[PDB]
Amino acid sequence: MSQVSPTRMNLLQRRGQLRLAQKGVDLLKKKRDALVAEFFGLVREAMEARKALDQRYAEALIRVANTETRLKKIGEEIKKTTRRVNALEQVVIPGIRAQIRFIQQVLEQREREDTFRLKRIKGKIEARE
Amino acid sequence: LDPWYRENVAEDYPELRDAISELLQREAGLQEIVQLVGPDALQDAERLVIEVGRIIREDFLQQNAYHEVDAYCSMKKAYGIMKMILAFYKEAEAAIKRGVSIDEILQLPVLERIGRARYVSEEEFPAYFEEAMKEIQGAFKAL
Amino acid sequence: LDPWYRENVAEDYPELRDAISELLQREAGLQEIVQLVGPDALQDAERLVIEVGRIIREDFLQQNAYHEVDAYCSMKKAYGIMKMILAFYKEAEAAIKRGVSIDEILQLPVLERIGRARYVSEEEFPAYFEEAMKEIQGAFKAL
Amino acid sequence: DRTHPIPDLTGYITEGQIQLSRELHRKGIYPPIDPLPSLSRLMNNGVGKGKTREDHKQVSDQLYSAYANGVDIRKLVAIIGEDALTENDRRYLQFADAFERFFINQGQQNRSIEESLQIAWALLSMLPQGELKRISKDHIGKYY
Amino acid sequence: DRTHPIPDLTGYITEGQIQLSRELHRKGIYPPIDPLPSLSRLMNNGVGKGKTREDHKQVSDQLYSAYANGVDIRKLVAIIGEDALTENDRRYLQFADAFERFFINQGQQNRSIEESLQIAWALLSMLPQGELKRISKDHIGKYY
Amino acid sequence: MAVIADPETAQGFRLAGLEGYGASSAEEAQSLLETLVERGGYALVAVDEALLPDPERAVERLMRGRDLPVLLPIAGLKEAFQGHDVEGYMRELVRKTIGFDIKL
């Protein structure tokens, strides 16, 4: 092609990665939100569970993991194949903008400079004649 | 030319075309971003704008030169179709703001009629406005 | 130009600037990673490198062209400030290796003096080296 | 094309540049000034005490910073949803609309610099005072 | 730009090319030779039994192939993450670092061809023996 | 939900009304996962971590399936509680996320 490719190209590129960046800080905020509901779950868990061991006392047990199991249920696996989700995702995504960026500039390289050896050759024919 | 339209056709001609153009303008920006980060992260509000933006393109911008009716669209018909689309927009944004699923609006029965409005040669078209409002009410009912 | 500095100013000019540059180089790499995974996972060793890297940037790289003193920094003053920073680095890494909290080093009293060293027009600056060592000892004391 | 040789060679002859953009005009923002391509190539020479007002540079800096953050947050809203935005970010998001509705938009109308700074301070109130990084405390106390 | 008409037309005039790369130099690898873009046109005329050693071509072929695979895998690591790489690919990834650290890098030092082949075989040990497609079994038994 | 734990504990979850199944090794326990998975009705299987030291390899082995039970290592056997399983489950979960084996 030629001109026009010129600017939508890289604002797909620039404006479009300014907001891929921005999903990046979004998800480390989630980071800090997620990891803090992570350990506390953990807490009572460890907890009256073994209140279960020395055991009625039947619930030091399911009382235990109704608390214990629930908390780490949400937190434990909802909390991250979805956490490790959020962030494992959007980064092969600044991969897009990344090497694919090399893409736009070998592309752009190729011709505002090539298109010019040329406006000037033709000058050159009866520019020289 | 806005005053000719305002005095002879419709008082809201300029405001309507500015509003539709802002719709199309917003769609263009949204599609550029979606080209990058995909459409999965899109909020309901942004999906609604694409839904109505698409209706503008298909139901208004597109005209069939080969159809005996849509080959020519009288001034009176142009504004009436515009108000059906813009009224569907307002109702769409209003329904979303009240937690109506966009999927529920996307399959709203009146939509298919709005799509064939360019083929109607009678004002039966402005009746679609009332047909749109009651239908949204049936969506305000089911919640 | 290294030999001119080694013979006329300081024998350790080249080694000192290479060491500071490696510091700045390491900081750059660390900041890139932190931009991704956040700073919460950072070990004390990595937090210390950022702490000293920051002191290099603020206390050395940055110079005030508007200050009557820091407007020009004589060769003799440049190396002396470098050795105060590099000596604080060695002591910092040495203290961490002995389980001294980085938070304890970050609020070390001498640090504020190192920060205003560029404003001193007297060698009172190399005295900061001994002031740094004893202060770390007071941190080796409290453990 | 701002790189065409004519407009491109003209930039050096100016002390202030106001760059208008079709994209911005198509979003209904008028005047359609690109806030990240308009420069006081010479702005600092025509502002301050004895020219406009002492707080002019600080207000201009703060509005520019807040509007730029607010525009980026429009992208973040699209990414995460409006409800997932923090309270602080929501204020910056809202500030961008306020800047466009009240500062950029004029109902054709000759605003004095005093009028323009007043609108600027009025919209700035939407932001937390603790978030006015680019306005020295002396100006906040005197003008906020 | 290696495609500029000057460097590009020069390639045909050579029997050996050593291509240096800024990217490699910026990683601190000196000499900054691109191991997948340096070639020998007349190389086969100066190697083998009675010149260097009989396994020279096989070793050169295997190192070139493994280094090229290892460099591509640096791209794959960026795409998927280090932990998602297979055990076999991880070995090739590591081989690329070993090739750069030990074979390319010389601490200024005059290596005999025997010394250079020895380093080559030492780094090749990092790869599974079953993955040495370009070295005949006769050479593996005699030299590995 | 099912729970897989050492036999004494498993018995106690049963007396509490829950669906506890007893095992005494990483392998035995993986077997139990596969029988449950094939048998079909569970949305979640909570497993003493002493019995599930590698839960990714665990998924890996279960199947050519089909929609899986979430698989949740929690800590064990009697002496496996009288640790704290969690301090280290937490070290792994933060490294897991941010990438950073943080100095806890």
UniProtKB/Swiss-Prot annotation, chain A:
Entry keyword set: ATP synthesis, Hydrogen ion transport, Ion transport, Transport
Cystine pairs: none
Superkingdom field: Bacteria
One BP annotation, GO: proton motive force-driven plasma membrane ATP synthesis
Gene Ontology MF, one: proton-transporting ATPase activity, rotational mechanism
Any one Pfam family match given in the protein's UniProt record, by short name: ATP-synt_D
InterPro entries: V_ATPase_D
Family stated for the protein in its record: Belongs to the V-ATPase D subunit family.
HAMAP family: ATP_synth_D_arch
Role noted for this protein: Produces ATP from ADP in the presence of a proton gradient across the membrane.
UniProt-recorded name of the protein: V-type ATP synthase subunit D
Biological source species: Thermus thermophilus (strain ATCC 27634 / DSM 579 / HB8)
Swiss-Prot record, chains B, C:
Ranges that cross the membrane: none
Protein function: Produces ATP from ADP in the presence of a proton gradient across the membrane. The V-type alpha chain is a catalytic subunit.
Protein family (similarity comment): Belongs to the ATPase alpha/beta chains family.
Name of the featured protein: V-type ATP synthase alpha chain
Species of origin: Thermus thermophilus (strain ATCC 27634 / DSM 579 / HB8)
Organism lineage: Bacteria, Thermotogati, Deinococcota, Deinococci, Thermales
Gene: atpA
UniProtKB/Swiss-Prot annotation, chains D, E:
Record's protein name: V-type ATP synthase beta chain
Family: Belongs to the ATPase alpha/beta chains family.
UniProt organism field: Thermus thermophilus (strain ATCC 27634 / DSM 579 / HB8)
Role according to the record: Produces ATP from ADP in the presence of a proton gradient across the membrane. The V-type beta chain is a regulatory subunit.
Domain of life: Bacteria
From-to range in the entire protein, with total length: 320 to 463 of 478
Transmembrane segments: none
Swiss-Prot record, chain F:
Pfam families assigned to the protein according to its UniProt record, in alphabetical order: ATP-synt_F
GO molecular function, one term: ATP binding
GO BP term, example: proton motive force-driven plasma membrane ATP synthesis
Origin superkingdom: Bacteria
Keywords assigned: ATP synthesis, Hydrogen ion transport, Ion transport, Transport
Alphabetized SUPFAM superfamilies for the sequence: AtpF-like
Family note: Belongs to the V-ATPase F subunit family.
Function statement: Produces ATP from ADP in the presence of a proton gradient across the membrane.
Protein name: V-type ATP synthase subunit F
Taxonomic lineage: Bacteria, Thermotogati, Deinococcota, Deinococci, Thermales
UniProt gene name: atpF
